[PDB]
Curated annotation (Swiss-Prot), chain B:
This is Epstein-Barr nuclear antigen 1. It comes from Epstein-Barr virus (strain B95-8) (HHV-4). Belongs to the herpesviridae EBNA1 family. Responsible for the origin of replication (oriP) dependent replication and maintenance of viral episomes during latent infection. EBNA1 dimer interacts with the DS (dyad symmetry) element within the origin of replication oriP and with a host mitotic chromosome to initiate viral DNA replication during latency. EBNA1 binding to DS recruits the host origin recognition complex (ORC). Governs the faithful mitotic segregation of the viral episomes by binding both the FR (family of repeats) element within oriP and the host mitotic chromosomes. The gene is EBNA1. Phosphorylation at Ser-8 increases the nuclear import efficiency of EBNA1. It comes from the Viruses. It is found in: Host nucleus. EBNA1 is possibly linked to multiple sclerosis in the host. Antibodies that recognize both EBNA1 and the host protein HEPACAM/GlialCAM can be produced when B cells undergo somatic hypermutations. A mimicry has also been proposed between ANO2 (Anoctamin 2) and EBNA1. Induction: Expressed during type I latency (proliferating memory B cells and Burkitt lymphoma cells), type II latency (Hodgkin's lymphomas and epithelial cell carcinomas) and type III latency (highly proliferating B cells and immortalized cell lines). The modification Phosphoserine is found at S8. Residues 2-8 are annotated as: Nuclear localization signal. Homodimer. Dimers can assemble into higher-order oligomers like a homohexamer. Binding to the DS element involves 2 dimers of EBNA1. Interacts with human USP7; this interaction is independent and simultaneous to EBNA1 interaction with CSNK2B as well as necessary for PML nuclear bodies disruption by EBNA1. Interacts with host CSNK2B (via KSSR motif); the interaction requires phosphorylation of EBNA1, is independent and simultaneous to EBNA1 interaction with USP7 as well as necessary for PML nuclear bodies disruption by EBNA1. EBNA1, USP7 and CSNK2B form a ternary complex. The N-terminus contains the region UR1 that binds zinc and is essential for EBNA1 to activate transcription. This domain dimerizes upon coordinating. The Gly-Gly-Ala repeat region (GAr) inhibits the mRNA translation of EBNA1 in cis and thus prevents MHC-I restricted presentation of EBNA1 epitopes to the host cytotoxic T cells. The chromosome-tethering regions contain Gly-Arg (GR) repeats that function as AT hooks and are involved in EBNA1 stable replication and partition of episomes. The C-terminus DNA binding and dimerization domain (DBD/DD) is required for the viral latent DNA replication.
Swiss-Prot record, chain C:
The chain holds residues 72 to 497 of 529 of the full protein. One of its GO terms (cellular component) is nucleoplasm. This is Importin subunit alpha-1. It comes from Mus musculus (Mouse). The gene is Kpna2. GO terms for biological process: entry of viral genome into host nucleus through nuclear pore complex via importin; positive regulation of viral life cycle; postsynapse to nucleus signaling pathway; protein import into nucleus. Residues 71-167 are annotated as: NLS binding site (major). Slightly detected in brain but not in cerebellum and skeletal muscle, highly expressed in testis and spleen. Heterodimer; with KPNB1. Component of a complex containing CSE1L, RAN and KPNA2. Interacts directly with CSE1L. Interacts with PLAG1. Interacts with APEX1 (via N-terminus). Interacts with FRG1 (via N-terminus). Interacts with ARL4A, CTNNBL1 and NBN. Interacts with ANP32E. Interacts with SNAI1 (via zinc fingers). Interacts with SNAI2 (via zinc fingers). Interacts with BAG6. Interacts with AIFM2; this interaction likely mediates the translocation of AIFM2 into the nucleus upon oxidative stress. Interacts with RSL1D1.
Amino acid sequence: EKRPRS
Amino acid sequence: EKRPRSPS
Amino acid sequence: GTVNWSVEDIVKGINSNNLESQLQATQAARKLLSREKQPPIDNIIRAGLIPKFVSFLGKTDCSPIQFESAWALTNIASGTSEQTKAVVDGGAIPAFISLLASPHAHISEQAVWALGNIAGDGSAFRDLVIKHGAIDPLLALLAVPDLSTLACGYLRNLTWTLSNLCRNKNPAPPLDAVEQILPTLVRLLHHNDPEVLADSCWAISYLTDGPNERIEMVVKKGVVPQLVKLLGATELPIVTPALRAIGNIVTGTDEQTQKVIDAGALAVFPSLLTNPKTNIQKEATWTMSNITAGRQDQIQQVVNHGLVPFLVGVLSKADFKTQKEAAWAITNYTSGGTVEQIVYLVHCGIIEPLMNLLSAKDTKIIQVILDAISNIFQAAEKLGETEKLSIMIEECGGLDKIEALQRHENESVYKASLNLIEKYFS
């Protein structure tokens, strides 16, 4: 899992 | 016997 | 004034050698990379901006440009493997690890986030992040008497990044890194935030997804009772990784399986085996199949907890992949169980749903079911009661199906189906 910071 | 989990 | 810049304008500002002009162009890049609709990650990469962003990470005298560049690089690293690789190739790993010591909480948090994206790409980058020495400063951020004093989002990001350091196989994480992380994982597993609990369970599920030696490292930390407690949580995002970890553990030794039973896990399985989420039923039934592959005293605990009727239930009605695991649970049960345990299985009504599943166009579950029938007949031979079982199988239409399987294409389906009829129906 990768997560962008929106 | 025991069956480990499939990669999918 | 940093909304909707072109990449060209961002390049112009970053190349300006005016620190404030660089800071504003970097923030403009961050806002570009923060948009849901198709962020121009590749255009930013091709503009050659990653080394500049990485260089900005080291500007301790300008904390805002450290933050903006860390955020921009985090969102690039959150993309494809090629996009994550571009961040790593820019030298970002040691720069982000240095930022873990930042006195600014929002900056060190961004470095935690970025390293989680990099480590989450795969085992290679995971082990490279470890080799650069990320574990010590990451765990140092959690070295407080009470986790509740930490900012909630901050703690959630640290837990998630730690879980990615536990993630992936071929190879599994280094043994010494797992030993270094585990005591903090155990503590996070007792924290009261639902997202920390879910990601802690995911980390444990990764660590138990391997050989018995990996499972043993986790079990000896004494976390199985807490895993069983989280098995009963109302939050599905907690139950799912908790159940995956429990299921992984019972793929190990009979002694490791017994720890799961001793902790009271079987009492949760009436709900798990009827759970409305298909994936939960499938995982719970797969777990049951590995428990019924255990010792006769462990099969007996399944009996005592009233779980055989629930296995009859899933065999009778469930999604097909769950019914396949139920078939395995029955074949393992009949393979290792006593005569009395097998008799009880028939008394609970296993025969008719077993026969109905011979209709299935899956050659492996047919082999599994035919094996179970043979095992049940072998116990009926020890009682001289094979005639009564033969009647039961025919009365529910099973013999019609077994005899149709004599003309089956796959080999061991029709060999085994003739042996049944030749021996018990002839």
